[PDB]
Amino acid sequence: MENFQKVEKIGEGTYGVVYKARNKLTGEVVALKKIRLDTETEGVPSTAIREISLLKELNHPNIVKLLDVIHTENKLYLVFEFLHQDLKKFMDASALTGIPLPLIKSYLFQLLQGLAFCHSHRVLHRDLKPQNLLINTEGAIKLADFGLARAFGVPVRTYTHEVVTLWYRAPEILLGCKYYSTAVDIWSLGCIFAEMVTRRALFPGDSEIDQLFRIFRTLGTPDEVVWPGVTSMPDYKPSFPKWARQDFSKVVPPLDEDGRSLLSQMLHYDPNKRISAKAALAHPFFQDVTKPVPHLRL
Amino acid sequence: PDYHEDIHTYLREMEVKCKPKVGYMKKQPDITNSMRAILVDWLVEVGEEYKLQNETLHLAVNYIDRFLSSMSVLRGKLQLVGTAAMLLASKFEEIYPPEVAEFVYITDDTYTKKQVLRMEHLVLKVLTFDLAAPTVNQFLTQYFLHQQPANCKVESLAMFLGELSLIDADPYLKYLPSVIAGAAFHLALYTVTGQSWPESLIRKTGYTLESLKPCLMDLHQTYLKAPQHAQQSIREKYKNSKYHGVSLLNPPETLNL
Ligand SMILES: NS(=O)(=O)c1ccc(N/N=C2\C(=O)Nc3ccc(C(=O)O)cc32)cc1
User: Fold this and answer.
1) Among the three residues B105, B132, B159, which one is the final residue of a domain in this structure?
2) Would the keyword Nucleus be found if you checked this record's keyword annotation (chain B)?
3) Does residue A85 have its Cβ closer than 6 Å to ligand 1?
4) Domains in chain B, number
5) I need a labelling partner for A225 at 20 to 30 A (CA). Which of A124, B99, B137, B210 fits?
6) Nearest to A49 among B3, B100, B131 (CB)
7) Which of B104, B90, B178 is nearest to B141 (CA)?
8) Does A130 count as an annotated binding residue?
9) Domain A85-296: what homologous superfamily?
Protein backbone atom coordinates (compact mmCIF):
# COMPACT_ATOMS: atom_id res chain seq x y z
CA MET A 1 0.00 0.00 0.00
CA GLU A 2 2.97 2.36 0.53
CA ASN A 3 3.40 2.55 -3.36
CA PHE A 4 -0.02 4.21 -3.97
CA GLN A 5 -0.69 7.97 -4.10
CA LYS A 6 -4.44 8.82 -3.67
CA VAL A 7 -5.44 11.34 -6.37
CA GLU A 8 -9.24 11.78 -6.15
CA LYS A 9 -12.35 10.14 -4.56
CA ILE A 10 -14.37 8.67 -7.47
CA GLY A 11 -17.37 7.14 -5.69
CA GLU A 12 -18.72 5.88 -2.37
CA GLY A 13 -21.02 3.20 -1.02
CA THR A 14 -21.68 0.64 1.71
CA TYR A 15 -19.33 -1.78 -0.26
CA GLY A 16 -16.36 0.52 0.34
CA VAL A 17 -14.88 3.80 -0.97
CA VAL A 18 -13.49 3.91 -4.55
CA TYR A 19 -10.49 6.24 -5.23
CA LYS A 20 -8.30 7.26 -8.18
CA ALA A 21 -4.69 6.48 -7.49
CA ARG A 22 -1.25 6.38 -9.00
CA ASN A 23 1.39 3.68 -8.53
CA LYS A 24 4.45 5.79 -7.50
CA LEU A 25 6.89 3.19 -8.92
CA THR A 26 5.39 2.21 -12.35
CA GLY A 27 3.18 5.30 -12.82
CA GLU A 28 0.19 2.99 -13.45
CA VAL A 29 -3.12 4.75 -12.81
CA VAL A 30 -5.48 2.51 -10.85
CA ALA A 31 -8.87 2.60 -9.04
CA LEU A 32 -8.77 1.51 -5.35
CA LYS A 33 -11.67 0.07 -3.41
CA LYS A 34 -10.99 0.72 0.32
CA ILE A 35 -12.85 -1.69 2.64
CA ARG A 36 -12.38 -0.82 6.39
CA LEU A 37 -12.18 -4.08 8.45
CA ASP A 38 -11.29 -2.54 11.90
CA THR A 39 -14.89 -1.15 11.62
CA GLU A 40 -16.20 -4.62 10.46
CA THR A 41 -16.85 -6.61 13.68
CA GLU A 42 -18.05 -9.59 11.50
CA GLY A 43 -14.82 -9.96 9.43
CA VAL A 44 -14.44 -9.75 5.65
CA PRO A 45 -17.85 -8.70 4.15
CA SER A 46 -19.62 -11.36 2.04
CA THR A 47 -19.65 -8.77 -0.86
CA ALA A 48 -15.80 -8.41 -0.80
CA ILE A 49 -15.48 -12.26 -0.68
CA ARG A 50 -18.13 -12.69 -3.53
CA GLU A 51 -16.61 -9.80 -5.65
CA ILE A 52 -12.92 -10.97 -5.31
CA SER A 53 -13.63 -14.77 -5.91
CA LEU A 54 -15.87 -14.13 -8.95
CA LEU A 55 -14.01 -11.14 -10.51
CA LYS A 56 -10.57 -12.79 -10.28
CA GLU A 57 -12.07 -15.74 -12.31
CA LEU A 58 -13.72 -13.34 -14.87
CA ASN A 59 -10.98 -12.27 -17.35
CA HIS A 60 -12.69 -10.37 -20.27
CA PRO A 61 -12.16 -6.99 -22.07
CA ASN A 62 -15.79 -6.06 -21.08
CA ILE A 63 -15.38 -6.88 -17.40
CA VAL A 64 -13.26 -4.66 -15.14
CA LYS A 65 -9.80 -6.18 -14.38
CA LEU A 66 -8.94 -6.80 -10.71
CA LEU A 67 -5.15 -6.21 -10.59
CA ASP A 68 -4.46 -6.92 -6.91
CA VAL A 69 -5.81 -7.59 -3.37
CA ILE A 70 -3.81 -5.94 -0.50
CA HIS A 71 -5.19 -7.76 2.54
CA THR A 72 -4.10 -6.47 5.92
CA GLU A 73 -5.07 -6.86 9.62
CA ASN A 74 -6.48 -3.27 9.54
CA LYS A 75 -8.16 -2.88 6.07
CA LEU A 76 -8.82 -4.56 2.68
CA TYR A 77 -7.97 -2.91 -0.70
CA LEU A 78 -9.02 -4.06 -4.14
CA VAL A 79 -6.66 -2.71 -6.92
CA PHE A 80 -8.39 -2.33 -10.36
CA GLU A 81 -7.59 -0.91 -13.81
CA PHE A 82 -8.72 2.71 -14.32
CA LEU A 83 -11.50 3.90 -16.66
CA HIS A 84 -12.39 7.55 -17.25
CA GLN A 85 -16.15 7.67 -16.45
CA ASP A 86 -19.38 5.79 -15.82
CA LEU A 87 -22.30 5.54 -18.30
CA LYS A 88 -24.42 7.80 -15.99
CA LYS A 89 -22.10 10.83 -16.35
CA PHE A 90 -21.75 10.12 -20.14
CA MET A 91 -25.57 9.83 -20.47
CA ASP A 92 -26.08 13.20 -18.62
CA ALA A 93 -23.57 15.04 -20.90
CA SER A 94 -25.29 13.47 -23.96
CA ALA A 95 -28.86 14.38 -22.67
CA LEU A 96 -28.88 17.53 -24.93
CA THR A 97 -27.00 16.13 -27.98
CA GLY A 98 -27.70 12.37 -27.82
CA ILE A 99 -25.50 9.28 -28.10
CA PRO A 100 -25.38 8.38 -31.85
CA LEU A 101 -26.88 4.92 -32.62
CA PRO A 102 -23.46 3.42 -33.80
CA LEU A 103 -22.12 4.16 -30.25
CA ILE A 104 -25.29 2.74 -28.51
CA LYS A 105 -24.88 -0.40 -30.70
CA SER A 106 -21.12 -0.68 -29.79
CA TYR A 107 -21.88 -0.15 -26.04
CA LEU A 108 -24.80 -2.69 -25.83
CA PHE A 109 -22.79 -5.28 -27.93
CA GLN A 110 -19.88 -5.01 -25.47
CA LEU A 111 -22.20 -5.09 -22.38
CA LEU A 112 -23.84 -8.23 -23.83
CA GLN A 113 -20.35 -9.66 -24.55
CA GLY A 114 -19.22 -9.19 -20.92
CA LEU A 115 -22.58 -10.47 -19.58
CA ALA A 116 -22.37 -13.60 -21.86
CA PHE A 117 -18.97 -14.33 -20.31
CA CYS A 118 -20.44 -13.73 -16.78
CA HIS A 119 -23.31 -16.12 -17.48
CA SER A 120 -21.26 -18.85 -19.26
CA HIS A 121 -19.00 -18.79 -16.09
CA ARG A 122 -22.04 -19.34 -13.77
CA VAL A 123 -22.01 -15.66 -12.49
CA LEU A 124 -25.08 -13.33 -12.01
CA HIS A 125 -24.35 -9.57 -11.77
CA ARG A 126 -27.74 -8.67 -10.09
CA ASP A 127 -27.01 -4.89 -10.06
CA LEU A 128 -26.58 -3.64 -13.62
CA LYS A 129 -27.14 0.13 -13.73
CA PRO A 130 -25.46 3.00 -15.68
CA GLN A 131 -23.11 4.05 -12.81
CA ASN A 132 -21.87 0.43 -12.48
CA LEU A 133 -20.83 0.59 -16.21
CA LEU A 134 -17.48 2.15 -16.99
CA ILE A 135 -16.31 3.74 -20.28
CA ASN A 136 -12.91 4.90 -21.61
CA THR A 137 -11.50 7.33 -24.20
CA GLU A 138 -10.24 4.43 -26.48
CA GLY A 139 -13.97 3.44 -26.97
CA ALA A 140 -14.52 0.50 -24.59
CA ILE A 141 -17.29 -0.15 -21.99
CA LYS A 142 -16.81 -2.67 -19.12
CA LEU A 143 -19.04 -4.16 -16.38
CA ALA A 144 -18.12 -3.03 -12.82
CA ASP A 145 -19.26 -3.51 -9.13
CA PHE A 146 -19.69 -7.21 -8.51
CA GLY A 147 -20.65 -6.49 -4.88
CA LEU A 148 -24.09 -8.17 -5.19
CA ALA A 149 -22.81 -10.75 -7.81
CA ARG A 150 -23.43 -14.47 -7.13
CA ALA A 151 -22.18 -17.86 -8.49
CA PHE A 152 -25.25 -19.78 -9.73
CA GLY A 153 -23.77 -23.35 -9.78
CA VAL A 154 -26.89 -24.02 -7.52
CA PRO A 155 -29.92 -21.60 -7.87
CA VAL A 156 -29.56 -18.19 -6.20
CA ARG A 157 -32.42 -17.50 -3.79
CA THR A 158 -33.96 -13.99 -3.66
CA TYR A 159 -33.00 -11.48 -0.90
CA THR A 160 -34.73 -8.07 -0.30
CA HIS A 161 -31.62 -6.19 1.01
CA GLU A 162 -29.39 -7.41 -1.93
CA VAL A 163 -31.28 -6.40 -5.16
CA VAL A 164 -30.63 -3.75 -7.96
CA THR A 165 -32.05 -0.19 -7.44
CA LEU A 166 -35.75 -0.27 -8.43
CA TRP A 167 -35.24 1.40 -11.85
CA TYR A 168 -33.51 -1.69 -13.34
CA ARG A 169 -35.34 -4.37 -11.29
CA ALA A 170 -36.99 -7.23 -13.23
CA PRO A 171 -40.80 -7.81 -12.86
CA GLU A 172 -40.16 -11.36 -11.40
CA ILE A 173 -38.16 -9.88 -8.47
CA LEU A 174 -40.90 -7.25 -7.89
CA LEU A 175 -43.67 -9.98 -7.94
CA GLY A 176 -41.62 -12.08 -5.46
CA CYS A 177 -40.05 -15.04 -7.33
CA LYS A 178 -38.15 -17.37 -4.93
CA TYR A 179 -35.08 -17.43 -7.26
CA TYR A 180 -32.83 -15.27 -9.48
CA SER A 181 -31.86 -16.19 -13.12
CA THR A 182 -29.62 -14.80 -15.94
CA ALA A 183 -32.83 -13.01 -17.18
CA VAL A 184 -32.62 -10.34 -14.37
CA ASP A 185 -29.33 -9.11 -15.91
CA ILE A 186 -30.91 -9.05 -19.46
CA TRP A 187 -33.92 -6.93 -18.25
CA SER A 188 -31.39 -4.49 -16.59
CA LEU A 189 -29.52 -4.04 -19.93
CA GLY A 190 -32.79 -3.68 -21.87
CA CYS A 191 -33.67 -0.75 -19.53
CA ILE A 192 -30.17 0.67 -20.03
CA PHE A 193 -30.45 0.27 -23.93
CA ALA A 194 -33.80 2.23 -24.00
CA GLU A 195 -32.29 4.86 -21.63
CA MET A 196 -29.34 5.40 -24.14
CA VAL A 197 -31.88 5.82 -27.04
CA THR A 198 -34.58 8.03 -25.38
CA ARG A 199 -32.05 9.99 -23.20
CA ARG A 200 -34.07 9.08 -19.98
CA ALA A 201 -34.85 6.21 -17.49
CA LEU A 202 -37.47 3.87 -19.01
CA PHE A 203 -38.98 2.78 -15.66
CA PRO A 204 -38.08 5.48 -13.02
CA GLY A 205 -40.12 4.11 -10.08
CA ASP A 206 -40.21 5.63 -6.56
CA SER A 207 -41.50 2.33 -4.98
CA GLU A 208 -41.98 -1.39 -5.80
CA ILE A 209 -45.66 -0.75 -6.74
CA ASP A 210 -44.76 2.43 -8.69
CA GLN A 211 -42.00 0.38 -10.39
CA LEU A 212 -44.46 -2.38 -11.46
CA PHE A 213 -47.13 0.07 -12.63
CA ARG A 214 -44.60 1.95 -14.80
CA ILE A 215 -43.64 -1.45 -16.38
CA PHE A 216 -47.35 -2.47 -16.77
CA ARG A 217 -48.25 0.98 -18.33
CA THR A 218 -45.56 0.46 -21.05
CA LEU A 219 -45.42 -3.31 -21.82
CA GLY A 220 -49.08 -3.97 -20.80
CA THR A 221 -50.25 -5.74 -17.61
CA PRO A 222 -49.02 -9.39 -17.87
CA ASP A 223 -51.57 -12.22 -17.74
CA GLU A 224 -51.44 -16.04 -17.62
CA VAL A 225 -51.22 -16.15 -21.48
CA VAL A 226 -48.30 -13.63 -21.73
CA TRP A 227 -46.63 -15.02 -18.57
CA PRO A 228 -47.84 -18.42 -17.28
CA GLY A 229 -47.83 -18.52 -13.48
CA VAL A 230 -47.77 -14.68 -12.99
CA THR A 231 -51.12 -14.74 -11.12
CA SER A 232 -49.59 -17.33 -8.64
CA MET A 233 -46.65 -15.06 -7.69
CA PRO A 234 -46.48 -13.94 -4.00
CA ASP A 235 -46.66 -10.15 -4.61
CA TYR A 236 -49.13 -10.42 -7.53
CA LYS A 237 -52.65 -8.89 -6.97
CA PRO A 238 -55.70 -9.63 -9.25
CA SER A 239 -56.82 -5.99 -8.44
CA PHE A 240 -53.90 -4.56 -10.57
CA PRO A 241 -55.11 -2.20 -13.35
CA LYS A 242 -55.09 -3.99 -16.71
CA TRP A 243 -53.22 -1.69 -19.13
CA ALA A 244 -52.56 -2.45 -22.82
CA ARG A 245 -49.13 -2.62 -24.47
CA GLN A 246 -47.91 0.73 -25.90
CA ASP A 247 -46.43 0.76 -29.44
CA PHE A 248 -42.60 0.75 -29.43
CA SER A 249 -42.75 3.72 -31.90
CA LYS A 250 -43.95 5.78 -28.85
CA VAL A 251 -41.70 4.03 -26.20
CA VAL A 252 -38.40 4.18 -28.24
CA PRO A 253 -39.16 6.65 -31.11
CA PRO A 254 -35.62 6.88 -32.67
CA LEU A 255 -35.23 3.06 -32.85
CA ASP A 256 -35.26 0.87 -36.01
CA GLU A 257 -37.18 -2.42 -36.67
CA ASP A 258 -34.23 -4.57 -35.36
CA GLY A 259 -33.55 -2.28 -32.35
CA ARG A 260 -37.26 -2.41 -31.45
CA SER A 261 -37.15 -6.24 -31.99
CA LEU A 262 -34.08 -6.86 -29.78
CA LEU A 263 -35.47 -4.57 -26.95
CA SER A 264 -38.89 -6.25 -27.01
CA GLN A 265 -37.13 -9.65 -26.48
CA MET A 266 -34.84 -8.17 -23.74
CA LEU A 267 -37.97 -6.83 -21.95
CA HIS A 268 -40.05 -10.02 -22.21
CA TYR A 269 -42.16 -10.60 -19.06
CA ASP A 270 -41.50 -14.37 -18.90
CA PRO A 271 -37.85 -14.99 -17.78
CA ASN A 272 -37.91 -18.39 -19.64
CA LYS A 273 -38.77 -16.61 -22.95
CA ARG A 274 -36.49 -13.54 -22.34
CA ILE A 275 -33.55 -13.38 -24.82
CA SER A 276 -30.13 -14.56 -23.61
CA ALA A 277 -26.86 -12.57 -23.90
CA LYS A 278 -25.64 -15.33 -26.40
CA ALA A 279 -28.87 -15.01 -28.49
CA ALA A 280 -28.94 -11.10 -28.52
CA LEU A 281 -25.30 -11.07 -29.78
CA ALA A 282 -26.57 -12.99 -32.89
CA HIS A 283 -29.49 -10.47 -33.40
CA PRO A 284 -29.64 -8.74 -36.81
CA PHE A 285 -29.31 -5.45 -34.85
CA PHE A 286 -25.50 -6.01 -34.54
CA GLN A 287 -24.91 -6.91 -38.30
CA ASP A 288 -23.19 -3.52 -38.95
CA VAL A 289 -21.57 -3.02 -35.47
CA THR A 290 -18.40 -0.80 -35.33
CA LYS A 291 -16.32 0.55 -32.34
CA PRO A 292 -16.66 4.41 -32.35
CA VAL A 293 -14.85 6.66 -29.81
CA PRO A 294 -17.11 8.78 -27.51
CA HIS A 295 -17.00 12.56 -26.80
CA LEU A 296 -15.71 12.75 -23.20
CA ARG A 297 -15.79 15.82 -20.89
CA LEU A 298 -13.30 14.86 -18.12
CA PRO B 1 -29.75 -23.48 -21.65
CA ASP B 2 -27.60 -21.30 -24.06
CA TYR B 3 -24.87 -21.22 -21.33
CA HIS B 4 -25.88 -24.52 -19.58
CA GLU B 5 -23.46 -26.63 -21.71
CA ASP B 6 -20.76 -23.92 -21.18
CA ILE B 7 -21.21 -23.91 -17.32
CA HIS B 8 -20.78 -27.75 -17.10
CA THR B 9 -17.66 -27.44 -19.43
CA TYR B 10 -16.30 -24.60 -17.19
CA LEU B 11 -17.02 -26.41 -13.86
CA ARG B 12 -15.33 -29.56 -15.26
CA GLU B 13 -12.36 -27.26 -16.11
CA MET B 14 -12.40 -25.61 -12.58
CA GLU B 15 -12.93 -28.84 -10.44
CA VAL B 16 -9.36 -29.94 -11.49
CA LYS B 17 -7.83 -26.52 -10.60
CA CYS B 18 -9.67 -26.53 -7.17
CA LYS B 19 -8.73 -30.20 -6.36
CA PRO B 20 -6.70 -30.73 -3.12
CA LYS B 21 -3.63 -33.08 -2.96
CA VAL B 22 -5.02 -36.68 -2.60
CA GLY B 23 -2.43 -37.90 -0.04
CA TYR B 24 -2.19 -34.64 1.94
CA MET B 25 -3.14 -36.38 5.27
CA LYS B 26 0.08 -38.51 4.93
CA LYS B 27 2.31 -35.38 5.07
CA GLN B 28 0.12 -34.13 8.00
CA PRO B 29 1.92 -35.16 11.25
CA ASP B 30 -0.71 -34.56 14.01
CA ILE B 31 -4.06 -34.99 12.27
CA THR B 32 -5.78 -38.01 10.52
CA ASN B 33 -8.84 -38.96 8.36
CA SER B 34 -10.74 -39.80 11.63
CA MET B 35 -10.25 -36.18 12.88
CA ARG B 36 -11.39 -35.00 9.39
CA ALA B 37 -14.39 -37.38 9.43
CA ILE B 38 -15.31 -36.14 13.01
CA LEU B 39 -14.89 -32.47 11.79
CA VAL B 40 -16.93 -32.92 8.54
CA ASP B 41 -19.73 -34.77 10.59
CA TRP B 42 -19.73 -31.92 13.15
CA LEU B 43 -20.17 -29.31 10.33
CA VAL B 44 -23.22 -31.42 9.15
CA GLU B 45 -24.83 -30.77 12.65
CA VAL B 46 -23.76 -27.03 12.47
CA GLY B 47 -25.53 -26.75 9.08
CA GLU B 48 -28.78 -28.20 10.56
CA GLU B 49 -28.71 -26.07 13.72
CA TYR B 50 -28.26 -22.91 11.57
CA LYS B 51 -30.38 -24.24 8.58
CA LEU B 52 -27.52 -23.69 6.13
CA GLN B 53 -27.64 -24.84 2.48
CA ASN B 54 -26.05 -28.20 1.56
CA GLU B 55 -23.78 -26.23 -0.86
CA THR B 56 -22.38 -24.24 2.18
CA LEU B 57 -21.45 -27.62 3.74
CA HIS B 58 -19.85 -28.77 0.35
CA LEU B 59 -17.82 -25.57 -0.05
CA ALA B 60 -16.49 -25.73 3.57
CA VAL B 61 -15.16 -29.30 3.10
CA ASN B 62 -13.39 -28.29 -0.20
CA TYR B 63 -11.76 -25.20 1.55
CA ILE B 64 -10.72 -27.45 4.46
CA ASP B 65 -9.04 -30.10 2.25
CA ARG B 66 -7.32 -27.27 0.27
CA PHE B 67 -6.13 -25.43 3.41
CA LEU B 68 -4.84 -28.77 4.89
CA SER B 69 -3.15 -29.56 1.48
CA SER B 70 -0.81 -26.59 1.94
CA MET B 71 -0.87 -25.99 5.77
CA SER B 72 0.27 -28.19 8.72
CA VAL B 73 -2.31 -28.08 11.53
CA LEU B 74 -2.36 -29.61 15.08
CA ARG B 75 -5.55 -31.41 16.32
CA GLY B 76 -6.14 -28.57 18.80
CA LYS B 77 -6.59 -26.06 15.96
CA LEU B 78 -8.35 -28.38 13.38
CA GLN B 79 -11.85 -27.20 14.60
CA LEU B 80 -10.74 -23.49 14.09
CA VAL B 81 -9.80 -24.34 10.47
CA GLY B 82 -13.31 -25.89 10.12
CA THR B 83 -15.19 -22.99 11.84
CA ALA B 84 -13.45 -20.26 9.64
CA ALA B 85 -14.17 -22.35 6.48
CA MET B 86 -17.90 -22.81 7.40
CA LEU B 87 -18.04 -19.04 8.13
CA LEU B 88 -16.43 -18.32 4.70
CA ALA B 89 -18.73 -20.83 2.88
CA SER B 90 -21.78 -19.18 4.62
CA LYS B 91 -20.55 -15.67 3.57
CA PHE B 92 -20.16 -16.93 -0.05
CA GLU B 93 -23.45 -19.01 -0.39
CA GLU B 94 -25.94 -17.96 2.32
CA ILE B 95 -28.33 -15.05 1.69
CA TYR B 96 -26.91 -13.82 4.97
CA PRO B 97 -24.45 -15.95 7.04
CA PRO B 98 -24.68 -16.67 10.87
CA GLU B 99 -22.76 -14.02 12.84
CA VAL B 100 -19.24 -14.71 14.19
CA ALA B 101 -20.58 -14.72 17.82
CA GLU B 102 -22.77 -17.72 16.90
CA PHE B 103 -19.84 -19.58 15.33
CA VAL B 104 -17.84 -18.96 18.61
CA TYR B 105 -20.89 -20.27 20.60
CA ILE B 106 -21.19 -23.59 18.61
CA THR B 107 -17.48 -24.29 19.49
CA ASP B 108 -18.52 -23.87 23.24
CA ASP B 109 -15.91 -21.06 23.61
CA THR B 110 -13.06 -23.48 22.43
CA TYR B 111 -11.72 -20.38 20.52
CA THR B 112 -12.19 -16.56 20.62
CA LYS B 113 -13.82 -14.12 18.14
CA LYS B 114 -10.26 -12.84 17.35
CA GLN B 115 -9.03 -16.40 16.57
CA VAL B 116 -12.02 -17.09 14.20
CA LEU B 117 -11.44 -13.74 12.40
CA ARG B 118 -7.65 -14.26 12.16
CA MET B 119 -8.15 -17.84 10.77
CA GLU B 120 -10.76 -16.50 8.23
CA HIS B 121 -8.01 -14.09 6.93
CA LEU B 122 -5.43 -16.94 6.93
CA VAL B 123 -7.84 -19.37 5.06
CA LEU B 124 -8.55 -16.55 2.50
CA LYS B 125 -4.76 -15.87 2.13
CA VAL B 126 -4.00 -19.61 1.74
CA LEU B 127 -6.92 -20.17 -0.70
CA THR B 128 -5.95 -16.88 -2.48
CA PHE B 129 -9.70 -15.89 -2.30
CA ASP B 130 -10.60 -18.74 -4.78
CA LEU B 131 -13.86 -19.67 -3.03
CA ALA B 132 -16.14 -20.37 -6.05
CA ALA B 133 -15.28 -24.11 -6.05
CA PRO B 134 -17.28 -26.76 -8.09
CA THR B 135 -18.95 -29.27 -5.73
CA VAL B 136 -20.73 -32.73 -6.01
CA ASN B 137 -23.87 -30.72 -5.11
CA GLN B 138 -23.36 -28.41 -8.20
CA PHE B 139 -22.84 -31.37 -10.64
CA LEU B 140 -25.84 -33.25 -9.13
CA THR B 141 -28.35 -30.38 -9.87
CA GLN B 142 -27.01 -30.07 -13.53
CA TYR B 143 -27.56 -33.89 -13.80
CA PHE B 144 -31.15 -33.81 -12.25
CA LEU B 145 -32.39 -31.72 -15.26
CA HIS B 146 -31.95 -35.06 -17.23
CA GLN B 147 -34.88 -36.72 -15.42
CA GLN B 148 -38.27 -35.58 -16.79
CA PRO B 149 -40.63 -36.36 -14.96
CA ALA B 150 -38.37 -35.90 -11.89
CA ASN B 151 -38.34 -38.22 -8.87
CA CYS B 152 -37.64 -36.21 -5.70
CA LYS B 153 -36.87 -39.47 -3.80
CA VAL B 154 -33.98 -40.04 -6.34
CA GLU B 155 -32.80 -36.40 -5.86
CA SER B 156 -32.86 -36.67 -2.00
CA LEU B 157 -31.08 -40.04 -2.17
CA ALA B 158 -28.35 -38.79 -4.56
CA MET B 159 -27.95 -35.74 -2.23
CA PHE B 160 -27.46 -38.16 0.74
CA LEU B 161 -24.93 -40.46 -1.03
CA GLY B 162 -23.15 -37.36 -2.36
CA GLU B 163 -22.91 -36.08 1.27
CA LEU B 164 -21.73 -39.44 2.78
CA SER B 165 -18.62 -39.13 0.44
CA LEU B 166 -17.61 -35.83 2.25
CA ILE B 167 -16.86 -37.78 5.50
CA ASP B 168 -14.34 -40.34 4.13
CA ALA B 169 -11.22 -38.70 2.51
CA ASP B 170 -10.10 -42.29 1.87
CA PRO B 171 -11.37 -43.10 -0.76
CA TYR B 172 -13.33 -40.02 -1.97
CA LEU B 173 -10.39 -37.55 -2.30
CA LYS B 174 -9.14 -39.68 -5.29
CA TYR B 175 -12.43 -38.91 -7.17
CA LEU B 176 -13.37 -35.56 -8.75
CA PRO B 177 -16.75 -33.94 -7.73
CA SER B 178 -18.33 -34.77 -11.19
CA VAL B 179 -17.46 -38.50 -10.84
CA ILE B 180 -18.98 -38.77 -7.28
CA ALA B 181 -22.06 -36.84 -8.51
CA GLY B 182 -22.34 -39.43 -11.38
CA ALA B 183 -22.03 -42.50 -9.10
CA ALA B 184 -24.47 -40.91 -6.52
CA PHE B 185 -27.17 -40.29 -9.17
CA HIS B 186 -26.80 -43.79 -10.78
CA LEU B 187 -26.88 -45.50 -7.34
CA ALA B 188 -29.86 -43.27 -6.26
CA LEU B 189 -31.82 -43.88 -9.51
CA TYR B 190 -31.05 -47.63 -9.53
CA THR B 191 -32.14 -48.01 -5.84
CA VAL B 192 -35.50 -46.19 -6.28
CA THR B 193 -36.58 -47.05 -9.87
CA GLY B 194 -34.13 -49.69 -11.09
CA GLN B 195 -33.16 -47.43 -14.03
CA SER B 196 -29.46 -46.75 -14.80
CA TRP B 197 -27.13 -43.80 -15.75
CA PRO B 198 -28.99 -42.22 -18.81
CA GLU B 199 -27.62 -41.83 -22.38
CA SER B 200 -28.37 -38.05 -22.18
CA LEU B 201 -26.03 -37.92 -19.13
CA ILE B 202 -23.50 -40.29 -20.94
CA ARG B 203 -23.44 -37.76 -23.88
CA LYS B 204 -23.31 -34.66 -21.56
CA THR B 205 -20.44 -35.76 -19.21
CA GLY B 206 -18.71 -38.21 -21.54
CA TYR B 207 -18.90 -40.75 -18.65
CA THR B 208 -19.86 -44.37 -19.31
CA LEU B 209 -21.19 -46.55 -16.45
CA GLU B 210 -17.78 -48.45 -16.80
CA SER B 211 -15.79 -45.20 -16.12
CA LEU B 212 -17.97 -44.63 -12.98
CA LYS B 213 -17.54 -48.28 -11.73
CA PRO B 214 -14.48 -47.61 -9.38
CA CYS B 215 -16.33 -44.72 -7.62
CA LEU B 216 -19.71 -46.51 -7.71
CA MET B 217 -18.19 -49.68 -6.07
CA ASP B 218 -16.96 -47.45 -3.16
CA LEU B 219 -20.18 -45.39 -3.01
CA HIS B 220 -22.18 -48.71 -2.91
CA GLN B 221 -20.00 -50.08 0.01
CA THR B 222 -20.34 -46.77 1.93
CA TYR B 223 -24.19 -47.00 1.48
CA LEU B 224 -24.32 -50.65 2.74
CA LYS B 225 -22.06 -49.90 5.77
CA ALA B 226 -23.65 -46.42 6.50
CA PRO B 227 -25.69 -47.62 9.65
CA GLN B 228 -22.40 -49.13 10.96
CA HIS B 229 -20.22 -45.93 10.27
CA ALA B 230 -18.94 -43.98 13.30
CA GLN B 231 -20.44 -40.71 11.86
CA GLN B 232 -24.24 -40.56 11.73
CA SER B 233 -25.29 -36.85 11.46
CA ILE B 234 -25.96 -37.26 7.68
CA ARG B 235 -28.19 -40.37 8.19
CA GLU B 236 -30.18 -38.36 10.86
CA LYS B 237 -30.52 -35.27 8.56
CA TYR B 238 -31.94 -37.46 5.65
CA LYS B 239 -34.37 -39.68 7.71
CA ASN B 240 -36.48 -36.43 7.88
CA SER B 241 -39.51 -35.96 5.50
CA LYS B 242 -37.67 -32.88 3.94
CA TYR B 243 -35.54 -35.46 2.02
CA HIS B 244 -38.46 -38.08 1.88
CA GLY B 245 -36.70 -40.20 4.61
CA VAL B 246 -34.22 -41.62 2.00
CA SER B 247 -31.65 -42.73 4.65
CA LEU B 248 -34.36 -45.20 5.92
CA LEU B 249 -34.40 -46.89 2.43
CA ASN B 250 -32.57 -50.26 2.22
CA PRO B 251 -29.61 -50.27 -0.22
CA PRO B 252 -29.49 -52.84 -3.07
CA GLU B 253 -27.60 -56.13 -2.38
CA THR B 254 -25.92 -56.09 -5.83
CA LEU B 255 -25.62 -53.45 -8.58
CA ASN B 256 -25.22 -55.97 -11.53
CA LEU B 257 -22.45 -54.19 -13.49
N1 LIG C 1 -18.14 10.07 -11.83
S2 LIG C 1 -17.39 9.83 -13.28
O3 LIG C 1 -16.59 10.97 -13.54
O4 LIG C 1 -18.35 9.45 -14.23
C5 LIG C 1 -16.41 8.53 -12.90
C6 LIG C 1 -16.97 7.39 -12.25
C7 LIG C 1 -16.24 6.23 -12.00
C8 LIG C 1 -14.89 6.16 -12.43
N9 LIG C 1 -14.07 5.01 -12.30
N10 LIG C 1 -14.48 3.94 -11.57
C11 LIG C 1 -13.73 2.88 -11.55
C12 LIG C 1 -12.48 2.55 -12.31
O13 LIG C 1 -11.78 3.30 -13.00
N14 LIG C 1 -12.20 1.19 -12.10
C15 LIG C 1 -13.15 0.64 -11.24
C16 LIG C 1 -13.23 -0.66 -10.79
C17 LIG C 1 -14.25 -0.99 -9.91
C18 LIG C 1 -15.19 -0.04 -9.48
C19 LIG C 1 -16.24 -0.50 -8.52
O20 LIG C 1 -17.19 0.38 -8.06
O21 LIG C 1 -16.32 -1.65 -8.08
C22 LIG C 1 -15.14 1.31 -9.96
C23 LIG C 1 -14.11 1.64 -10.84
C24 LIG C 1 -14.29 7.30 -13.05
C25 LIG C 1 -15.05 8.46 -13.25
Assistant:
1) B132
2) yes
3) yes
4) 2
5) A124
6) B131
7) B178
8) yes
9) Transferase(Phosphotransferase) domain 1 (1.10.510.10)
- The alpha carbon of residue B46 is apart from the nearest alpha carbon of chain A, in Å, by 18
Regarding whether B33 and B53 lie in a shared domain, the answer is: yes
- Same-domain check for residues B35 and B162: no
Give the single-character DSSP code of A60.
Answer: -
Q: Which residues contact A17 (CB under 8 A, 6 or more apart)?
A: A9, A11, A33, A34
From A99, A87, A35, A58, select the one nearest A295 (Cα to Cα).
Answer: A99
Q: Is A206 a catalytic residue?
A: no
CA distance B218 to B236: 21
Residue whose CA is closest, atom 17 of ligand 1?
A: A144
CB A185, CB A121: distance < 8 Å: no
**HSE-up of B7 (CA within 13 Å, CB side)?**
24
Which residues on B lie below 8 Å from A39 (Cβ)? none
Q: Tell me whether residues B91 and A119 touch, CB distance under 8 A.
A: no
Q: Kindly state whether residue B1 falls inside one of the protein's structural domains.
A: no
Rounded to 10 deg, the angle between the B4-17 and B136-144 helix axes is 160
Given A56, A151, A154, which is nearest B141 (Cβ)? A154
Domain of residue B36: give its range: 20-132
Q: Is the peptide bond before B171 cis (omega within 30 degrees of 0)?
A: yes
Mutate to test the pocket of ligand 1, among A4, A64, A137 (most ligand atoms within 8 A of CB): A64
Confirm whether B82 is domain-assigned: yes
Resolution (A): 2.8
Catalytic-labelled residue, pool A38, A68, A127, A223: A127
* DSSP SS3 for B199: helix
Experimental method for this entry? Answer: X-ray
Which CATH number fits the domain that encloses residue B188?
Answer: 1.10.472.10
Whether B246 maps to a domain, the answer reads yes
CATH number of A1-84: 3.30.200.20
- A71: nearest CB among B1, B117, B121: B121
